Amino acid sequence: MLQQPTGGYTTLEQFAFTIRNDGTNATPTQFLQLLSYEATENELVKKTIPTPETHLPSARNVPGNVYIEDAITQALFGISAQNVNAHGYFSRLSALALPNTSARLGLDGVIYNSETINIPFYDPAAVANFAATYAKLGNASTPRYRADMIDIYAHVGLELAGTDAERAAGVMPVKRAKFDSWEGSLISLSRDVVNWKILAFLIDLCSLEGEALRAFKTRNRDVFRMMLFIMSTAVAANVVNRKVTKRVDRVLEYIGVNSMRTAGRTATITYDLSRHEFAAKFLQLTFTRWN
């Protein structure tokens, strides 16, 4: 079980997160700086977010040994995922929040019926509060319940390049990111983030309380910023390379605006239409719960 560590499940250290800065790994805090910010004459307003309708898909138990945690990490960051929004996997998960259910979430991220001995997991109460909230994403696709997209992205930007006087205020000028590069760097970081066990960071974002939370948000303010950037890459429209001195540089065109497609079909990772339907309803939950 591992019970739960007080101060997070992310303070354990068995499973952490390191972006591979080429031949040598690093920490998310250490990577953010290699990037600078260019203020352009465009402005976004921080728009309020609507509440999420409470109606997570009912319990079914088809027998699949569903890799729910693996599926989640794949769509947001994964390189060209397929059938991400199919209905069967989530429905199975929602069974989890149920008081008294022989169905334990494996530590490795695989869900089971009944149990096992050889495999340690997360105590049933930690997962109960988790699936209470991320089961809802399941039906994000329905015509009626479906979430926005062209507007949640007014938040992505403040975090990635949000100046402190800017996230203190409401409006931030449209920025333009640019950082050093190794050519295959955009895909390379996206290939890397896929294995962070992003389950651990979320299954504890619903279990931590009033003080343990105040300390959690003030430390992992990076581990969040990271997956936000890699995600904001697929969305922004034009990638321009600058050849200076003996250096080479990647510019991400606009941090805060949904172009609606492409980014660079070759220079980065792309988002299908069944991705904007997903990544959107995702951010609508983590953001709200986050703040």
Place this chain on the structure above:
Amino acid sequence: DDLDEGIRMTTYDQYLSHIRERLHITNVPDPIYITGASTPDQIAASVQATHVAVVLYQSGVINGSASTYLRENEVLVVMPDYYDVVSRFANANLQMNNNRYHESVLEIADIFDQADFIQTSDAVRQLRALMPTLSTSQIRHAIERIAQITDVDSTDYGKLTLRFLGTLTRSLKMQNAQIRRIRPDGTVLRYDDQIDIEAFRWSRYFLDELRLRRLSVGLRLITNPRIARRFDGVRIMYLTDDDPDPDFVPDVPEGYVAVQYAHRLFSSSLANKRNRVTYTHPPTGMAYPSPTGRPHVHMTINERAGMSKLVADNIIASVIKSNWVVDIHDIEYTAEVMTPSEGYTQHVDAESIMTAPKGKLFHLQFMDGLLRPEPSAFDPPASGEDMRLIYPLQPISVARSMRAIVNHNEVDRPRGAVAPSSYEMDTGTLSRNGDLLYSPVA
């Protein structure tokens, strides 16, 4: 609660057939009658002698202290017939007499702990109840057919032929036929301990150890959740989407009114200038003569034999033009998954799904299509396409060792692919005596 504990009730006829003839073989005094007064003292002391762990209920009200002695000791009670259990013991303070209801389980007759008896198990009853019903002449026919398939001749089994009467036939349906001795009167005596040989002690009529041990193993393959591939019922809806795998049950939408189908709520009345088949909303009592514009409902057809053709069309049109969720039950079908490429081989109609005979099971194939290469970047677009009309709700996904053994670029599994389980890949060891055991774990 817990859907367990409390008290254990069984009908008197079930007691006499299984329990009474089996505890009778041993030399134990017959189970003590439950007292009209209270005996929470010797209830188990007189039950200790019999070893049966069951107590015969007769008359009166069971005491409060005797009401809790039955709960803790796991002892059983047999009542002649239960209309209620309220007045049988008069549940005093807590709420039990007839509120937090019963359930349905099986005993396997494990409450003997005495070997050489109770050879069969739970599963044999499930098969019997699964059976329809067999008449005397049907049983006689069934015995004949299994006999003649294996060369074993039956010149005249089950009938007596007198030369001055002709040929008179008897029935062949015995049960627990325990060969016992007749007294001059004709009335059945008793075991006859100390005489009679003892070979007539039991038994279920089979070739000693050989058949009983062979049947025991073979019976388990019959009751396995991989062989039973006869799925029941089908839900019919008109939501239009594409799904990678079969057995996709589309859950009923957020806010619906579930109405039970009746042979009454559909009436024929005049609207405009013509005669039309009209729905009648049960909770509000309204008209809606049009096949469209009716408030959405969740229908449930049980009798799909009495409905007129016009009612079926109304049902099969309101699903299309008003988003009704309809349901069928008497329909029986055998489902088998179909590869994405090549397409379908057989297609049925929505009019035949409403007229199919009760006991005639047809097969309707479900499209898999999990692994299918997507179109190229440069090609003509589409315009408002596929609508799917039928959905299984059993569900059908039963036997699969693994599925879609193709790698998705590059080192990862394709979405919704399974691998073989850690059970068909474990060769264990023999028992401390005679049969196969597992690893074991930990």
Place this chain on the structure above:
Amino acid sequence: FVPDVPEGYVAVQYAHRLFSSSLANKRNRVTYTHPPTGMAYPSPTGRPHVHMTINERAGMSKLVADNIIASVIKSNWVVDIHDIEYTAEVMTPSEGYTQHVDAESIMTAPKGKLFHLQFMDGLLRPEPSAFDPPASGEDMRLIYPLQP
């Protein structure tokens, strides 16, 4: 009879700029935009209740010129045309209908053409009997006038 906009609707203009082709699931399908919110809606289902008015059928790609009509039948879309001329006339209950315009020749035809329609009157229509088994089927109207 001129049927109006029922209730909750929003009047939007037409430009080929809001009808673009995109990719969803495993097929290429023409996508709407809905300018007052800027969304996707990749299929002729779940489209918000609009009152789309068309001034001229100029750059109407026959694929997307069709997709509007396919969305009328599955999303209750109320559409408009302004450059069409017709000389429809009132018809008696008996002798029914003779010729009729196609729902595709009224969207992808030359601007100059003048085709005539045919309308019904039915006040002297013979009514049903007393006791009778009801017949199945219902009948549609796709093109209404607005003059009157």
Place this chain on the structure above:
Amino acid sequence: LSDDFKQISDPKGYLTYSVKYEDQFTKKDKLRASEADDRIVGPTVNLFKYGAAVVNIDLNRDFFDTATGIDLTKGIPLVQDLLVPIGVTAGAEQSAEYVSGLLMVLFKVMTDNRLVIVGETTTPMSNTLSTVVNNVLRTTYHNNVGVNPALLRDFTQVNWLNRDITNMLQQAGTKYGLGLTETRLDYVRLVKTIVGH
């Protein structure tokens, strides 16, 4: 002598494997191994050819044949006659033809009588096996070949599938292996010796 049961060379089994291939999913890497690396894990590779859609298990189409009335083309054991309406003629298709067929498949398994006889068996050398297939073989594999997942431990180009197999055959909870294994009932002479395969 009475001779109740007859003996056979190789056992059959009640549960077998089926497959639906996709004739457009071929890998461009023609891999290769040794001959004893081929034999033990050989036919099992050609049952799970790269690009198989579904591989499910059910009743054997052979053991229960039309010689005993059992017929299963659909996947359901369907017998022609057992329990039926009598005065009325039979139907073209009935659901009763299943409850009766499932009763008949229980008859054949009960009246069984077969003794397995060690036949054909051959032994390979340590020099002619991969270090991954070597430890699986106890000492002597039964002649002929068997189909089993995990036997294809390191012979599939399916990179993902190769993972779970190694993980399950590592956690000490399961141990696969074919060949002549150690037994309790050993050296027990019944005119001829008892071995466990």
Place this chain on the structure above:
Amino acid sequence: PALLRDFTQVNWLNRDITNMLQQAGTKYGLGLTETRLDYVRLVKTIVGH
């Protein structure tokens, strides 16, 4: 006029039969009702239909 309790299209008549036939007073039956067995031979003889 009772065996058709759920086979007629005529709506008003259907509800009425399934009301007075469903009644706690009367009940309808069809077929074999009971059997009288033999003393010495032990075979069915006089059957009630």
Place this chain on the structure above:
Amino acid sequence: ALNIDHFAASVLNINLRALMEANVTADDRIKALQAHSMISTQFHGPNQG
């Protein structure tokens, strides 16, 4: 990792980088067609991107 000399290996590598990097979408070919016909001609078809 092949067995050709370092000159030819360097030539083929630089010849490949300029193909992967330098981008031209389907739209760029559709924008060129609007320059060789009567102004106001309308093109539809392959997805812009």
Place this chain on the structure above:
Amino acid sequence: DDVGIMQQKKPPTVVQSRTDVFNEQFANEALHPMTKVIFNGLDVNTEVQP
């Protein structure tokens, strides 16, 4: 996840309602996933760009 070379399989597509008076009945159709096109004989894009 790759673009297919060999041709695939189709329902295939079929045309239905067009005129200003329908009176449809909803009988038959395919319960099997199919496709229905409004306009008759569309698919117009004959220009090939080498």
